[PDB]
């Protein structure tokens, strides 16, 4: 198998700037007929992949001039001169030169915007979840930038890293922010043994730690 390796994994770009994505192959993708069937696909979330470039350098019908491909040996490059919002998504390289046909792992093209502090909301376990013997504490950190944010839970002032599940949305199309959900799941008994539950939002240099708390009473 030709292994296809893409870099970078993610690429934040300002709208209207240049982007370039690299794709390396573990071996020659020159087919015996002399041609190199290196393709680029764009996959937007909710959608299926779309063909942009075929045979290293040829723009597929309808694809704007801002997309171009280069490369030859084991290294291939897609450049986008002047990225627009419609260009955002996951780019995959693909070789159709040798069976089995193989894809690169994808490169996520993202828009840059001004840094935005999250809106933080904390929620106690509902009464309904307690009747069933469970207790999840839910924290929303909504509409922030950049993607990498640090969430810390504290129980009565002591950090808890263990029973927590985080999930991140795809970059918002309208405002270019990310949102995150953080869930601390505990048993009802464990929950009833403690009082202060706190969800904390930070970077690592951000001098604004946003703390939200409740006391169960």
């Amino acid at each position: 198998d030709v292994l296809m390796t893409q870099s970078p994994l993610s690429l934040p770009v300002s709208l209207g700037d240049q982007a370039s994505i690299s794709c390396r192959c573990s071996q020659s993708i020159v087919k015996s007929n002399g041609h190199t069937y290196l393709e680029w696909y764009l996959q937007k979330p909710g959608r299926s992949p779309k063909l942009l470039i075929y045979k290293v350098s040829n723009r597929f019908s309808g694809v704007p001039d801002r997309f171009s491909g280069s490369g030859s040996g084991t290294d291939f490059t897609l450049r986008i001169s002047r990225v627009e919002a419609e260009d955002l998504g996951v780019y995959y390289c693909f070789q159709g030169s040798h069976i089995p046909w193989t894809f690169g792992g994808g490169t996520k093209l993202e828009s840059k915007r001004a840094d935005a502090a999250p809106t933080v909301s904390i929620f106690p376990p509902s009464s309904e979840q307690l009747t069933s013997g469970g207790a999840s504490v839910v924290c929303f950190l909504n509409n922030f930038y950049p993607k990498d944010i640090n969430v810390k839970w504290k129980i009565d002032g002591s950090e808890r890293q263990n029973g927590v599940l985080n999930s991140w949305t795809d970059q918002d199309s309208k405002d270019s922010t990310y949102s995150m959900s953080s869930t601390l799941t505990l048993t009802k008994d464990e929950y009833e043994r403690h009082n202060s539950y706190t969800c904390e939002a930070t970077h690592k240099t951000s001098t604004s730690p946003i703390v939200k708390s409740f006391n169960r009473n």
Partner: protein
């Protein structure tokens, strides 16, 4: 309008069988090679099987050889993928794609191979911690817990409340999924105007509507 429409994706127990279909339109079907390409939950794309326009020639990666069989009914404009002795490694979104290196893709159909049991979700309301706070906007939520398989569908006020919502990807914790959804509204409109999350889980044939009420 050139179209590929996949169907037949379902939940199968490991060792089980499934046949997927792919209906084509807008082109002379028998004139084109076709493939199946799966996308994993980690979002890797993997080419799975190819067949010639005339049906006579097929190929497979070694990882699916002898388990999967590609075929087509040209008279019916249908491509098929017969999957047998399935394992969890085969869990993926399965795309139908046309050879020009695939210039046309379907929307895909989901296959999940798992010994984990079909389970309806528990839906819990997330109303603000009892203290009345504070600014122009109030964030509410619904917690959708312990279902299997994916997907679930979450709406707010039957879909009439669409702006200001974040529905998060589910996370798998030992055989079961948990997802949450937030909605933010003007602080003046709640609780005076009802906010209800509607959760559908087709696999279990369940719908749950949970009106968000202030807590006491």
């Amino acid at each position: 309008d050139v179209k590929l429409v996949e169907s037949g994706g379902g939940l199968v127990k490991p060792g089980g069988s499934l046949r997927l279909s792919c209906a084509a339109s807008g082109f002379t079907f028998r004139n084109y090679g076709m493939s199946w390409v799966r996308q994993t939950p980690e979002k890797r794309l993997e080419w799975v099987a190819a067949i010639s326009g005339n049906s006579l020639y097929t190929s497979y990666p070694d990882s699916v050889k002898g388990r999967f069989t590609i075929s087509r009914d040209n008279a019916k404009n249908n491509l098929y993928l017969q999957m047998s002795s399935l394992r969890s490694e085969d869990t993926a979104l399965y795309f139908c794609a046309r050879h020009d290196f695939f210039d046309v893709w379907g929307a895909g159909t989901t296959v999940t191979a798992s010994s984990a049991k079909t389970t309806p979700p528990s839906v819990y309301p997330l109303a603000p911690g009892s203290a009345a706070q504070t600014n122009s906007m109030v964030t509410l939520g619904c917690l959708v817990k312990g279902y299997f398989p994916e997907p679930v569908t979450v709406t707010w006020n039957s879909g009439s409340l669409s702006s200001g919502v974040h529905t998060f990807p589910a996370v798998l914790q030992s055989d079961l999924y948990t997802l949450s959804s937030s909605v933010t509204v003007p602080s003046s409109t709640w609780p005076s105007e009802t906010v209800t999350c509607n959760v559908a889980h087709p696999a279990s044939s369940t719908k749950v509507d949970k009106k968000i009420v202030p807590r006491d």
